[PDB]
Each structure stands twice: as structure tokens, then as C-alpha cells.
Structure 1
């Protein structure tokens, strides 16, 4: 039928008024036979007439039989090159607003095949305004059609901050979140989550996804048997979690993230620890629910199971730090870490091979645990004080003379802050004093960081309640800086500086 394609091509190619309607159904029958379909290609005027008529026609079948062809040329690598040369990409994009469901299914599948195998197709679809046409199609209800459309969006948006911003301006975030809450088709949910994953690293799309209820929507699929859907949801959840602190209705998501901590897959545990750490930051409501569902008990087991892997212990310690301070059941959480055999492993994380991010979080956790008087003794017997003193002395020497994303001033303030709370116990005060820490505490009063002066004067105020320590604080020449610290803009520095001065006299 090749020798015949030159006659057939001239026929439809002809066109005039209705001749066309019928002129197409025949190229559709010719596209159904592969031998004649191969001959349908290679003829530039033919393929260019199929697309040209497709956008001009207005009959009932309009695009169906013509797009029926390009659906079949899209199956051939030669046909994909033919549609690319015919300029069908801008016309196929025009059909993404067509009312007929048949052309919409044929146009989104042809563009999809072009986007996967035809070079330069991603850029041509963008120029035709395809991104906006595809986002507007996300209101359909055919899951097979929605799976093809979202995959085109992921192909176009990945590695393209321009496309991510266009999807945002088109209402993409809200439309993709709706698919998460509505459908159960795994292929559509997985692909939609891949689009949301690509969008979640964009600083402009992340809040919009959060506002659309994406955190709650992604949580609905954390129990799905499809590990690729749960893993993609967790990755997207961790990316958006820093901007979800004002979100409510998180009771179900927070409960599931606690269960996922017991999983055997490291990526699942690593994400769940990171999301819980971010959702509990400055959210006393989230601190309460996580504590109510046994979150302290689960996080201690996770830190115990992890050991050396800092990708798990650093967020899990950060979450444990949030849960043990500044909420109604924080006192129970500080006791819970002890009762679940957590105190030995927490002090262990202060020692090598721990890196500075994990050590910073572990010091902040020890400061919170020390608020519980039942933790004053076991933290001492585990050796928390001598190690915290060594970390403080070393970090102060580095200050006087950003190591892995941590400024040493934060280690100085954290270690002095933890020692300030531990100094409430009288036996800890003997250990702190025996390490000759007063000369450094006095030196820390001169620090430019007000928060360092606050914990320095506070720990000196706790020690000065014993006569031997108050006399030693005076001999260190601490009367001079504490006098200047009485005029501190910080209310805590001035009050602590007055407490040491009163005890010295």
C-alpha cells in the first residue's frame, strides 16, 4: 500500500469542506494498518495536513480521527520525529482545552510519548503553553487520564524552576493535593506525589502546597502497601515540614509517623524522624500529641537502633529535644527518656565519632532532661558533666583563635546552658567546681553574645550559693564584669549578675 500512499495522501491532503471529515476517517483506517501507517509518515505534507486540519476543524468527530493517527505515529520513533517536524506539539497543546474526551486522551498520550522519547519536546511543550493547559486538566475524573497528565507535569517540571513557578501560578499545588485526597489509584497517586516532590524543593511552591493541606493529604497514604508511594510521600513530607508548623488536623499524620519509626527500612525511619523533628519545633500542640502516642518511647528505641548513623540520630535527638521542653507533658517526657533507658545513649552521643550537628542537638537534649530532678543523678553517673565541660572548653578555644554547619559559639552557649541546669543539684555543683570551670565561666561573661553571658552568669549564680564557690568566684575577679552586666539590655543577664554579686557579699 506504499505505492498507493502517494494517491491516498493527495486525497485527504486535498481537503475543502466536509470532504475532510471523511477524508480523515480514512487516514485513521490507514493508520490502523502498520504497513500503510509507515507510508503515512515520511510524507511531510500529509502529516502536516493531519495536524493543520485538526486545529481548524469543528465537526463532531473533529480531532478524533486525525489525533487517532498521531496517537499511532507516536508509537513509532519515526512518527515521533514526524509530529515534531509537523509542528503538532503546539496544536496538540491546543487540544488540551478541547471538550471531547477522546481527543483529550489522544492528545495527552501523544504529548506524553513525545515527552519521553522525542528530543526537544519538553521545551516545545513549554513554549506552547502546555503547562497551563495540563494543570487545568487536573479537574478530570479518569484516573488513567490523570496519570498521563501528571507524568507530563513531572517530566516538564523536573530540573526546571521556570516550569515549577508556572505550575504554581496555575493552581498546580491545590489541584495536585486534591488528587491525593480523592483517588486510590496507585499509579496516579505515585505520579502525583512525584510532581509534589519536585515542587516541594521550590521555596515558592512549598508554602502553597502546605496551605492546600498537602501535609494531611500525603499522610493518608503512609500506610499504603506500595513502598514507592510511601517513600515519595515521606520525602515530600520532609521537604514541606519546616513550613507546616501552623497546620492543624495533624493528629492522624503525627500518629502514623511515630509508627513508621519502628520500620526496618532506613529511609522510612530517617524521614519519619526528620518530619517529627520539624513538626514539633515550636508547636506545643504537636509536642503533646506525639507524646500521647508514645513518641518518646519510640524515639529512644530509634536512637538505640540507629547507633552510628547520624542521618537518623540527629533528627531523632532534635525531636526528643523538642518534646522535653515547653509543653504541658514535658515533665513526663523528661522522665520518659530516663525510664526507657535513654540517658546512657544520650550521653554516649556527646563522644566521637559524633559530628557537630548531632552533638549540638544532643547538648540541647541534655539541657532539657536536666530540668527533671530525677535526671540530676543518672546524668552525672553516666559522665555527662565532664564531657560537657570538655566540649565547652574546646569550643571556647576555637572561638578565641562554621565547622560542619555549626558555629562554635552555639556549642559554647549550649554546653554552658546545660551545665546551668545541672548545677541545681548539689553533687553536680561539686563535680562542676572540681573541674576548675569558674575561670572559664568568668571569662564567658565578657562574650559578645548576650545569650552566652546569660548562661554564664546563671551557672555562676547556681554555684555561688555555696560559700567556697562564691569566694572562688570573687577571687576570679568576677565582680568587675558582673557590675557591667547589671546594665545589660538582656533582662536575664542583669538578674543573674545581681544574684552572684549579692551572694559574694
Structure 2
């Protein structure tokens, strides 16, 4: 401090210079005063010099002058008050101006001083946003030095987190495409982890997610699912899960779907839950993805996941959902319906219909059972496992709650799913004796009166399969169903009209 606190007032005169060359020879001096801790603890001390370093750094059109001036601000950036000094000096907009400077060396001090400001200085995020540094940081994502890219992506992550307007600026600045490029072309873990944190923050925005998917983000995140760094894989999985609802049109997912299946066998419950969630979303409405997941043993992996998950519905509900997807509207679905039985899946699926399962899990499980029931080899084991009495009790109770949303599930979807499962199970003659013995024919006739056209179709279809037996056909008639079936014959839904025409013919 000798040649410091006391060396301060002379340095204020040595900072401010009017000559385009004496302030240059002064700036390279101030850099030397920045390299010594004693002299920079004096630069931190008085705010006059700090404003002059910031001013002359804006004024200078010489690269070397701008470097030592920024390196000075960098050395002040290690000190807590140095930050407060740059905050007073208004250097944040000045530092932003050099995010467009070309020489690398000055970019590296500026993005670091801004980084330390965003971490330890209060209100710094608001100042960088006002200065338009967000758009300058996204443009910097094209540079090549990985240590520089790791700091820039972190600055964007601290700024975008919890701020929806910062996320929309990153979108408008082409951020999604730039961040995805970083994931495809670099192997440095610190940068890839930070970039995935940015994409994770952008993944929850309704506008950013389609653009990330458009840029190939699903495939880019898939490349790092095999990485030994847990924080990288986990953030990739969290990000993949948020975008997976918008990626039903993407192709080239063969590698991702194969890795996702292996991740189901993982011991990390967060890894397993995410992989089950992504696979469930990507297999929806995508026949090609259904084929691939089945081609890499996905049914067997999902059945093992549901067995290992037990009572945790964070795992079973997506894994059941994915299983219901892979068992319908898809080429090798008949082999998938059998595969569930072959891997001892039928007992656990029926179990998930009983407590303590919550209604969302029950919805998927009933849907899974309809698809499994399409395979005749599943008719007898589903009956032996006790599926028909339980589906009937769920249907009866759900129908009373409709006459008089639970867990986000409307009971009318329980009514429709349970009647649909019974519709397919009723193809087997022994299931029809069980369904008939439960005195379900009444309730089925009531469902013909239901306003939901899908509930009318499953109700008329199950009565149609039942009406092929003589004893049952008389019971449907005695139930008075001949009159609703007449109004059903003239329905906008075909399926409602044809099933009503079939039962009517069966009653003779």
C-alpha cells in the first residue's frame, strides 16, 4: 500500500491521458499495476482510476491499448469491490461493446469480467440485459476456444435462468442452433455440461423447444448419453425429456432410441425415469420409432423396468405408456404383445390396476391391456391373472362418479378404456362367460346412452361380441337395448352405427 494507497493519486493522473499515445503508454503501465496485488488493491480502493480505465478502454481504437485495459478490469474482477468498481464505472455496457471486438485476447478478459460480475455482483444480470450483451454472447458462440465457449455459455445460463424474456432473446438470436452445434462438435466436458444447462433452461419454454428440436437437439444430446460424466448425461436426459413431445417428426433417432433402452437397465433412478419418459413420448404416433425400440429388445427392457420399479409410479407410468405404444399401430406389434407375456409381464400389468396405483397409472395400464388382448395367446393368461373382474370394478365405479377430474384423469376416460379392454377380451368365449357372469350387460346398455361417441362405440362393440352367444343375446334384448341401438344406427361415428347394426341382427 506504500506504493499504492499513496500511489493512487499519482496514478489517477497517470490513468487519464489526452494523447492517443500517452494513455497507451499509461494503459500498459496500469496493466503492470494490475498484475501486482498491492497496486490493484489500490485500484479497487479509489473509484476515479476505475472509471478512467473503463472510459479509455471504450475510446481506444488500438488493440494493445484495449487489451491491457481489459486485463486490468480482469484483475479487478478477482476482487469483490473491483466488481463494485466496474459497476460504478459503468463498464458492463463497455464490456458488452467488446463482445463484438475481433481480437481474441480482449474477448477473453471481457467475457470473464462479465462472468465474475454476473456471479458475485448484485443486479449485474439486469445490466447485461439492458446493454444487449445477451445478443452479443450468442454471436460469440461461433468462436472455437473451448475455455472461452465454456464461460460464454455459463453467462447465458445465469442470464436465462428464471427469465422468460432472456430465453426469447436467445431464441431470436439463433441461440438454439448455436448451442446444438456446440453439442455436436466439441468433446470438452465443462463446455458440453454448461451448454446442456442452457438447453435445459431453454427446454421448458414453449417457443424455444420446437427450435431446439428443429436444430437437431434430440440427436445432438443423444451423442453424450454414453459419457462417463454423470452430470452431463443427467442434464442431457432432463433436456431430452422436455423436448421429446415435440420430436415426433424427427428422424435419425436410431442411435438415441438404442441408448435409451440400455439406460433403462441403469441403476440411477433418475436415469431410468428419464429414459422411460423419453421413450414413451418418442414412441407415440411414430410407427418407425416403435419398430426400432422393439428391434433393440425394448419390450423386454421395459418389462424388466416395470418389475424393478414396483410401487414407484414415476417409473411405471411412462414405462407402461411406452409399452402400450409398442403394442399397437405398428408392424411387429403382434410380436410385442406376445413379448410382454414371454417376459412374465402379464402378472405385473394386472397388479398395477389395483391399489396403491394412482389414476394416471391405471389409465395407461388399462390401455396396455386392450393392446395385449389383441393377441389371442394373451386371452387366457389375462383371464387367469384376474384382469376381467378388476376392469369391471373400475368401470362400474368410474361410471357412478360420472353420473353423480380425479388425479387429472376424467372418469369418462376410465369408462372408455375399461369398456374398450373388455371389448377385445370378449373375443374369447371364456372371457364372455366371465363378463356375462359379472352382470355387466345392464351397465353396457346404459353406456349406449352416454354422450361420448367413443363410449357408445366400445359399449356397442362389447355387446356385439357378447350377442354372438344365444343366452346373452336374449339378455341384451331384455335389457331394452334394442331401442338405443336404433338411434345408434344413425350416428355420425361409423363404428357406433355398425356395432349397433350387428347386435340388432344377433337378436332374432
TM bucket normalised to smaller:
over 0.9
Cα shift readout 1:395-444 (whole Å, capped 9, x = no counterpart): 00000001011000000000000000000000000000000000000000
Answer whether contact 1:310 1:358 (CA < 8 A) is retained: yes
Q: Which residue of structure 1 aligns with residue 319 of structure 2?
A: 316
Cα shift readout 1:139-186 (whole Å, capped 9, x = no counterpart): 011000000000000000000000000000000000000000000000
Q: Which runs of 5+ in 1 are unaligned?
A: none
How far residue 450 of structure 1 moved from its aligned partner, in angstroms, is 0.2
Answer whether contact 1:15 1:23 (CA < 8 A) is retained: no
User: Are residues 1:489 and 2:492 paired?
Assistant: yes
- Separation (CA, whole Å) in 2 of partners of 1:394 and 1:444: 13
- Separation (CA, whole Å) in 2 of partners of 1:404 and 1:64: 60
Cα shift readout 1:250-269 (whole Å, capped 9, x = no counterpart): 00000000000000000000
Answer whether contact 2:11 2:49 (CA < 8 A) is retained: no
Q: Which residue of structure 2 aligns with residue 134 of structure 1?
A: 137
Q: Which residue of structure 2 aligns with residue 174 of structure 1?
A: 177
How far residue 17 of structure 1 moved from its aligned partner, in angstroms, is 1.9
Answer whether contact 2:44 2:85 (CA < 8 A) is retained: yes
User: Are residues 1:407 and 2:374 paired?
Assistant: no
Q: Which residue of structure 2 aligns with residue 431 of structure 1?
A: 434
Q: Which residue of structure 1 aligns with residue 152 of structure 2?
A: 149
**Cα RMSD (Å):** 0.6
- Separation (CA, whole Å) in 1 of partners of 2:476 and 2:58: 88
How far residue 386 of structure 1 moved from its aligned partner, in angstroms, is 0.2
How far residue 309 of structure 1 moved from its aligned partner, in angstroms, is 0.2
User: Are residues 1:125 and 2:119 paired?
Assistant: no
Residue 433 of structure 2 aligns to a residue in which SS?
Answer: helix
Q: Which runs of 5+ in 2 are unaligned?
A: none
- Separation (CA, whole Å) in 2 of partners of 1:179 and 1:376: 51
Farther off after superposition, 28-37 or 314-323 = 28-37
Answer whether contact 1:324 1:331 (CA < 8 A) is retained: yes
TM-score norm. by structure 1 comes to: 0.99
Cα shift readout 1:362-383 (whole Å, capped 9, x = no counterpart): 0000000000000000000000
Answer whether contact 2:44 2:79 (CA < 8 A) is retained: no
Cα shift readout 1:58-111 (whole Å, capped 9, x = no counterpart): 113131010111101000001000000100000001110001101100000000
Residue correspondences, number: 505
Residue 224 of structure 2 aligns to a residue in which SS?
Answer: coil
Cα shift readout 1:423-475 (whole Å, capped 9, x = no counterpart): 00000000000000000000000000000000000000000000000000000
Q: Which residue of structure 1 aligns with residue 424 of structure 2?
A: 421
Answer whether contact 2:27 2:69 (CA < 8 A) is retained: yes
How far residue 42 of structure 1 moved from its aligned partner, in angstroms, is 2.9
Q: Which residue of structure 2 aligns with residue 54 of structure 1?
A: 57
Residue 448 of structure 1 aligns to a residue in which SS?
Answer: coil
Answer whether contact 1:55 1:91 (CA < 8 A) is retained: yes
User: Are residues 1:222 and 2:205 paired?
Assistant: no
2:268 counterpart (243, 265, 268)? 265
